[model samples]
Target chain A: GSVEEIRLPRAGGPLGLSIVGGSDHSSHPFVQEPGVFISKVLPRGLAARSGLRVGDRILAVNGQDVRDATHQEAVSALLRPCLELSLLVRRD
Target chain B: PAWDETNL
Candidate 1:
């Protein structure tokens, strides 16, 4: 009994793209500080098909800036099963 | 060509 449908806080903006899925994608951004990074990319995952490789710094999800969140929160936002994710990512 | 195309 949870109504938390997973909505990114209104901070970044709106990501016009649609996500089919994602993975650990073992990649980290060289921010010199605590920052979220693609840790792994499951083989044959939707992210793999979409060319979302590892080492990409995820700035926002569904157009909402999640950079302000802890690494754990960022992961939580991405793993929203049975929902649509419009992510706005960036490269190091 | 269009002055400005895509906005990256």
Candidate 2:
């Protein structure tokens, strides 16, 4: 029930996660514009050690608010070439 | 695009 920021470094692959939710899809049943959520976290992957958990909603990316962002927008923010990812996420 | 476990 807390919001936190975490950094995950490159692990020789993508962030190792599948994100869902956003305006392009049916909104989360219990919340409006719940933003993109971590639908799956790769086991033994970077996200697994970065404290990322399934169902966690990404509130922002690299200090930019994405609570109202779309799937493509979040994807754009995450795929920008970088050695690490800085994300603000909320767990429910 | 439709959302369907889109990997990133």
Candidate 3:
């Protein structure tokens, strides 16, 4: 389960992807996905430039498991800001 | 900057 599991198809790119860990259910709204509580982000990746960093609890992507959270519905409430991309995170 | 959901 990695974030790569939930990346939506990049229109027609190389299968825009992520590895949201759990099972083969990255967009099922009710499946589990793997995650890493981000303690650090690379300098020029989508995450770092998006302001994602230490202490944030990553939880879902597109429509995948957010680790502990149970559904993608929580996404609207939890995910937002349309970063021109995706950024599943929890900064509480 | 404080985290805000301005354009979410």
Winner by DockQ: 2
- Full candidate order by DockQ, most accurate first: 2, 3, 1
Query: What does candidate 1 score in Cα RMSD to the true structure?
Result: 14.6
Candidate 1 has a TM-score of: 0.53
Off by over 4 Å in 3: A1-35, A69-85, B1-8
Candidate 2 Cα outliers beyond 4 Å, as residue runs: A29-33, B1-3
Question: What DockQ do you compute for every candidate structure?
Answer: 0.02, 0.66, 0.03
Where model 1 places Cα greater than 4 Å from the true spot, the runs are A1-29, B1-8
If scored against the real structure, what TM-score would every candidate get?
0.53, 0.84, 0.36
Worst 10 residues of 1 chain A by lDDT: A16-25
Chain A accuracy as TM-score for every candidate: 0.57, 0.85, 0.39
- The best candidate by lDDT is 2
Error of 1 at B3 (Å): 46
Write model 2 residue lDDT over A1-92, tens digit each, in one string.
67888789875357788888776666663345557888888897788888888878888888878888877888887777776788898876
Cα deviation at A60, candidate 2, in Å, is 0.8
Model 3 score (lDDT)? 0.38
What's the best-to-worst order under lDDT?
Answer: 2, 1, 3
Predicted candidate 1 versus true structure: per-residue lDDT over A1-92, tens digit per residue: 21112233322233222221122223233444444655455555555445554555566766567666654466567555544555566654
- Residue A27 error for model 2, in Å? 1.8
